[PDB]
Chain A
């Protein structure tokens, strides 16, 4: 099955360089164009450029906005795509996607990764502090405090709990983020059976479990 996975994104200092990776499988790689697109959080998609297929000589084109500063390459042995970025600015902070591409005629062959978050900032990386939020139905929560950069991911019971969950958009403040997640379950479930929020902050190699307990 067609796979694309972006990686190599995280925090980089302004003026820095950073190369993103995009591994692919499940289709004849060299037959497709490969494209890079970005999206500042809460903003709009911006096409960045592409590298063409084998028959087209693997040639490259770029958005005027990044011609001369970003470089696109592909390793046809690893079926890997790459985006080399230089002189990074706060404005370049975005989720970056790779997507399968081809001549305009075959638009329907588009297939995207889930992206990776690149935060350009001089702020220092900081792991999250996770606190439990105890009170017929009942609401529990988890406070995720004092971490940088985005992102963190919050699950309840490792993903078994998708219903009644409100994970809130992180918020910056003095170069530190703070987000929160509430889950609303029946009274017969908690505190009879455990409710545990699972917090992952990759950029600080952190994984924190937190059980919610009464009193």
Chain B
């Protein structure tokens, strides 16, 4: 029943900055026979399986940049990144292997970047979909920042599905898709279809649209 707790739950920092994060054990992880702390740090990038960085609380694993440092002994342990890079985006987990195994809740590391603008693409229902009774119009909000964003669905002047990508690993950006899902027959009934994209980079939405009758 060794319990692990991590703090803080999340961290946002711009490239170049230093960061620390902590990990607390309900009891000592120091082996009095190897004189080592059975405490390891793992980094898990979105889409990937956890990968080891440090073990024995201190010693780094091969290929792991030296900007990563594990430290502490006993019950309190820390991971320090001397200078965060864009690739450092990931959730960071500590793990005790002193008696059985336990992971702390993790620490999510987000990246602050130069406030960037989206890129909007509009897509009408595909032939195949209409001939299936349904019809969806899709909007692609690509490579912006931050995630603070909303989509207004104007039809001729509900049933919506949104989804944010996870932060990119080089341009530290975000993307989104609003899928206004519709019936064929009621898509057949109106003309102009627009997706107003409210961002905090402008007091006027991004303008992408099409007229059904023109397709």
Contacts and interface: CB of A to CB of B under 8 A. Distances in A.
A141 interface: yes
Contacts of B166: 169
B103 A178 contact: no
Contact of B52 (A37, A108, A145, A169): A108
A64 B162 CA distance: 37
Given A44-B93, A47-B101, A182 B142 contact: yes
B93 A45 contact: yes
Given A168-B175, A178-B161, A180-B138, A104 B31 contact: yes
A171 B164 CA distance: 10
Interface residues of B, number: 50
A63 interface: yes
Contacts of A115: 49
| A46, A97, A110, A178: residue with the most chain B Cβ atoms closer than 10 Å | A110
Given A64-B1, A139-B140, A169-B163, A110 B103 contact: no
Interface stretch (A72-80, A85-93, A130-138): A130-138
A171 B100 contact: no
Given A47-B100, A104-B98, A182-B177, A141 B49 contact: no
B49 A131 contact: no
A169 B164 contact: yes
A112 B49 contact: yes
Interface in B89-139: 91, 93, 95, 97-98, 100-103, 105-106, 119, 121, 123, 125-126, 128-129, 132, 134, 136, 138
Given A45-B106, A131-B129, A171 B56 contact: no
A166 interface: yes
Contacts of B128: 129, 131-132
Given A107-B38, A129-B132, A145-B136, A50 B101 contact: yes
A61 interface: yes
Contacts, number: 121
Interface string A173-192: 10000111010100000000
B165 A169 contact: yes
B140 A107 contact: no
A68 to B, nearest CB: 15
Given A141-B140, A169-B163, A63 B103 contact: no
Contacts of A145: 129, 134, 136
Interface in A119-137: 129, 131-135
14 contacts: A37-B103, A47-B101, A47-B103, A61-B100, A104-B97, A104-B98, A107-B52, A143-B129, A143-B179, A145-B129, A166-B165, A168-B175, A180-B177, A182-B121
Interface of A: 35, 37, 44-47, 50, 61, 63-64, 97, 101, 104-105, 107-108, 110, 112-115, 129, 131-135, 139, 141, 143, 145, 166-171, 173, 178-180, 182, 184
Interface of B: 1, 31, 34, 36, 38, 40, 42, 44, 49-52, 55-56, 61, 91, 93, 95, 97-98, 100-103, 105-106, 119, 121, 123, 125-126, 128-129, 132, 134, 136, 138, 140, 142, 161-166, 175-177, 179, 181
The 6 A-B pairs at the shortest CB distance, nearest first, are namely A104-B38, A107-B55, A131-B126, A47-B101, A104-B97, A139-B121
